[PDB]
């Protein structure tokens with residue numbers, strides 16, 4: 653379609669379903685997730701968002717990203733820091749795993765944010781809008797499956813405090829995406845990059861599943 657947001661959604665339908673079909677994610681949906689599994693996914697998210705938000709700040713004033721810059725509404729790094737301090741303890745920075753699959757994702761994020769800025773929107777879109785609109789169902793499952801204490805912490809990642817209405821913010825963000833000016837060629841690369849984002853998540857899930865079944 654003409655609208656980039658609508659174009660992205662349609663192009664990534666296949667891969668998104670592929671992501672839902674991933675073994676690790678299948679179990680997740682079937683309410684089957686363990687503490688070790690959830691810890692691994694949280695650590696992954698921490699690394700992914702550290703890299704993504706590092707690159708967003710580097711290109712926040714660029715006309716190729718500025719229109720979709722919503723730092724207060726979307727930042728997740730601080731939330732994950734809080735969360736990992738719960739899951740891995742006070743020395744979490746020293747013990748959280750940083751696997752090859754995580755490194756491949758982080759590496760693509762830095763390359764994009766450093767040499768192909770116009771493609772950063774593909775990752776911001778995939779991560780932010782994906783986690784926001786899907787957070788509810790993912791958290792619901794997690795908390796009833798993890799049976800954690802009334803600690804009052806460990807899942808801050810699933811709540812975007814600076815966003816009163818998810819649906820409302822989503823349409824705003826989409827509107828801003830469709831306001832972005834880019835050559836047909838770039839537009840194609842952004843759509844491709846979005847598919848690449850899903851592939852990076854899929855290989856991540858495959859790796860985490862592998863680490864948990866020994």
Ligand code: HEM
Nearest residue numbers: 661671672677680681777778779781782785786789850853
């Ligand atoms: C537990 C597996 C998953 C399930 C069952 C799932 C579920 C959801 C739900 C409920 C929505 C909102 C409705 C919609 O699709 O429009 C959503 C949207 C989306 N998801 Fe997922 N998702 C999963 C994994 C992922 C992963 C791994 C990514 C990739 C980083 C992702 C990226 C997206 C994106 C970008 C959207 C927004 C699409 C749009 O409305 O334009 N999802 N997801």
